[PDB]
Write a protein that binds this ligand. Structure first.
Ligand SMILES: [Fe+3]
Ligand SMILES: [Fe+3]
Ligand SMILES: [Fe+3]
Ligand SMILES: [Fe+3]
Ligand SMILES: [Fe+3]
Ligand SMILES: [Fe+3]
Ligand SMILES: [Fe+3]
Ligand SMILES: [Fe+3]
Ligand SMILES: [Fe+3]
Ligand SMILES: [Fe+3]
Ligand SMILES: [Fe+3]
Ligand SMILES: [Fe+3]
Ligand SMILES: [Fe+3]
Ligand SMILES: [Fe+3]
Ligand SMILES: [Fe+3]
Ligand SMILES: [Fe+3]
Ligand SMILES: [Fe+3]
Ligand SMILES: [Fe+3]
Ligand SMILES: [Fe+3]
Ligand SMILES: [Fe+3]
Ligand SMILES: [Fe+3]
Ligand SMILES: [Fe+3]
Ligand SMILES: [Fe+3]
Ligand SMILES: [Fe+3]
Ligand SMILES: [Fe+3]
Ligand SMILES: [Fe+3]
Ligand SMILES: [Fe+3]
Ligand SMILES: [Fe+3]
Ligand SMILES: [Fe+3]
Ligand SMILES: [Fe+3]
Ligand SMILES: [Fe+3]
Ligand SMILES: [Fe+3]
Ligand SMILES: [Fe+3]
Ligand SMILES: [Fe+3]
Ligand SMILES: [Fe+3]
Ligand SMILES: [Fe+3]
Ligand SMILES: [Fe+3]
Ligand SMILES: [Fe+3]
Ligand SMILES: [Fe+3]
Ligand SMILES: [Fe+3]
Ligand SMILES: [Fe+3]
Ligand SMILES: [Fe+3]
Ligand SMILES: [Fe+3]
Ligand SMILES: [Fe+3]
Ligand SMILES: [Fe+3]
Ligand SMILES: [Fe+3]
Ligand SMILES: [Fe+3]
Ligand SMILES: [Fe+3]
Ligand SMILES: [Fe+3]
Ligand SMILES: [Fe+3]
Ligand SMILES: [Fe+3]
Ligand SMILES: [Fe+3]
Ligand SMILES: [Fe+3]
Ligand SMILES: [Fe+3]
Ligand SMILES: [Fe+3]
Ligand SMILES: [Fe+3]
Ligand SMILES: [Fe+3]
Ligand SMILES: [O]
Ligand SMILES: [O]
Ligand SMILES: [O]
Ligand SMILES: [O]
Ligand SMILES: [O]
Ligand SMILES: [O]
Ligand SMILES: [O]
Ligand SMILES: [O]
Ligand SMILES: [O]
Ligand SMILES: [O]
Ligand SMILES: [O]
Ligand SMILES: [O]
Ligand SMILES: [O]
Ligand SMILES: [O]
Ligand SMILES: [O]
Ligand SMILES: [O]
Lengths: 169, 169, 169, 169
């Protein structure tokens, strides 16, 4: 058929990466609606996490498209529900979001390493152009938010959270 | 004449609901001008309650229009003055506004229940399309405001009230 | 808080309905990418199921928004993977899609019935306006497709599938 | 001069790759004019292969430009005539086109592997951005066409070929 220089190991890892992205998307949808509760009511934080949900979903779809293009076979698994039902403060949420992005990034780097080992340049390029740079920029942005949240919730935690949501997000 | 499947019980309840809406409107006009006093001076809160006064007045007029369309007879009663002359802080005001909206909502649901009992689908539809959804959205919005006010007036009550009026309203 | 006339039974059912919609969306994403395989290659069928994936996701998000507005608490569960990994012919796929939509519709009607029992008109209206009509139109459309597929794959199954994808989808 | 980190092995391989691309272009020009014969008369297939002829020629010219930029020396060889004078059916032609693209892709991957061995990142990047992704997409597209042709020429080969040329190409 069309399949060429595309190892079963890469195929399998691509499928696992699809699962991680759809799970991240699901986590971010839960984060977003949490911040939209009447007893939380931080619209800007809700909007930030809903954007991220969409981004992660796009990520998965690009992976799935790439899987088809290489002649791999997509295989879907159960999507585990997010690790929490309530996400605490903006501070807690942004910490959990960075932890999540780091673990996506690590999976991207593992796939890239596998790609190199197998001499699969097309895999490596595709991750490079579409995933690795974006993750880096996103993680930088989240780190910056985290610094600003922390500096604001020194004293006057409630005031700090409100001001962050209003003037940054 | 035109009157068809429109019970005297519904007619009476519609008239009482008109009275509740005009009273709410009157309450909100008093809330608005309170916040416009030189010793209160929270323009954004004044503007929020003046919008609500207009909305409640529209509500009443739609009810009165519906009463005519069904061939009921409008009957006006005295409008009781608002329960307070001074409304305290933004926090106090938003609490009183939610209490008021809840009691409008309860009257809307009672009318709907009566409408069902009497097999009056047109009444039920009219409340559905024009009143029940709006009340839900409005009460959600007021709950959100209340959360933000409370989080801001933890410490530094005056600063918190100012920031809310400036950055939310 | 804001919660008013919103029973724990309705809250629970809304959460289950969110799960069904996200599962449908996941099924449709798997259907779409299946038809985009190089050994299936029916772009119009891929595009039809990818539209449906997006629609089901929107459905879930509206439900989640409604849950917040009523003061319910969203709770996420694990999303079960689609019931199949390969979906056979366009005929097989459209049959499975109708079965799925019927089961969403049945859940919508069950929720509506619960809504009535609990005298929760806002729930009933929300399902009415946003879900019940769309499901009906969608199921009609899928039935129509099914008739056309069947009439085409009488003899010359491959020719019939190609012509359907090209001239209908 | 300008030449830096550009091995004679890479230079030689680039020259061979130019020859393969110009040969592919020549093959596609022969495929195109075949389908434009009065006794074949499949304009859409002619147009598809004439586009590919132009694409392969562009490919060669980019390679030759890159050779100059690195300070390599272009060397031209004889271009072998296409392996066939007549190309059979659309099915036969699309099979031969996929075989050809696979062999271009393999040469691109070999050059990339050489590029890595020699620590020549600029070579690797240039193939990545300009060649490897396009080949993958093209081979996917040709596989898809092949599936559709095959499904159509089950029974009624002539009808199937006509419909493919009219509704796909
Ligand atoms: Fe909102
Ligand atoms: Fe808003
Ligand atoms: Fe908004
Ligand atoms: Fe967006
Ligand atoms: Fe968006
Ligand atoms: Fe957006
Ligand atoms: Fe987008
Ligand atoms: Fe986006
Ligand atoms: Fe995006
Ligand atoms: Fe992006
Ligand atoms: Fe993007
Ligand atoms: Fe499979
Ligand atoms: Fe919880
Ligand atoms: Fe590379
Ligand atoms: Fe003023
Ligand atoms: Fe002013
Ligand atoms: Fe002004
Ligand atoms: Fe206005
Ligand atoms: Fe106005
Ligand atoms: Fe105005
Ligand atoms: Fe108005
Ligand atoms: Fe208005
Ligand atoms: Fe209005
Ligand atoms: Fe309105
Ligand atoms: Fe209006
Ligand atoms: Fe007084
Ligand atoms: Fe006074
Ligand atoms: Fe009804
Ligand atoms: Fe496509
Ligand atoms: Fe296409
Ligand atoms: Fe397309
Ligand atoms: Fe769409
Ligand atoms: Fe879309
Ligand atoms: Fe679209
Ligand atoms: Fe949409
Ligand atoms: Fe859509
Ligand atoms: Fe939509
Ligand atoms: Fe829709
Ligand atoms: Fe819509
Ligand atoms: Fe909860
Ligand atoms: Fe399978
Ligand atoms: Fe109803
Ligand atoms: Fe011509
Ligand atoms: Fe012509
Ligand atoms: Fe022409
Ligand atoms: Fe061209
Ligand atoms: Fe041209
Ligand atoms: Fe052209
Ligand atoms: Fe061109
Ligand atoms: Fe071109
Ligand atoms: Fe081109
Ligand atoms: Fe190109
Ligand atoms: Fe180009
Ligand atoms: Fe010959
Ligand atoms: Fe000849
Ligand atoms: Fe590289
Ligand atoms: Fe690279
Ligand atoms: O909002
Ligand atoms: O968005
Ligand atoms: O993106
Ligand atoms: O996006
Ligand atoms: O003002
Ligand atoms: O207004
Ligand atoms: O309104
Ligand atoms: O209004
Ligand atoms: O496509
Ligand atoms: O779409
Ligand atoms: O929709
Ligand atoms: O949509
Ligand atoms: O032509
Ligand atoms: O062209
Ligand atoms: O190109
Ligand atoms: O081109």
């Amino acid at each position: 058929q069309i399949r060429q220089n595309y190892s079963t190991e890469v195929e399998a890892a691509v499928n696992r990466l699809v699962n991680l992205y759809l799970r991240a998307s699901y986590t971010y949808l839960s984060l977003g609606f949490y911040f939209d509760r009447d007893d939380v009511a931080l619209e800007g934080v809700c909007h930030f996490f809903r954007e991220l949900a969409e981004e992660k979903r796009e990520g998965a779809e690009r992976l799935l498209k790439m899987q088809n293009q290489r002649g791999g076979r997509a295989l879907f698994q159960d999507l585990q529900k997010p690790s929490q039902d309530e996400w605490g403060t903006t501070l807690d949420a942004m910490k959990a979001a960075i932890v999540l992005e780091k673990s996506l990034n690590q999976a991207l780097l593992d796939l890239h390493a596998l790609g190199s080992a197998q001499a699969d340049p097309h895999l490596c390029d595709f991750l490079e152009s579409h995933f690795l740079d974006e993750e880096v920029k996103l993680i930088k942005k989240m780190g910056d938010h985290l610094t600003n949240i922390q500096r604001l919730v020194g004293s006057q935690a409630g005031l700090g959270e409100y001001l962050f949501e209003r003037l940054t997000l």
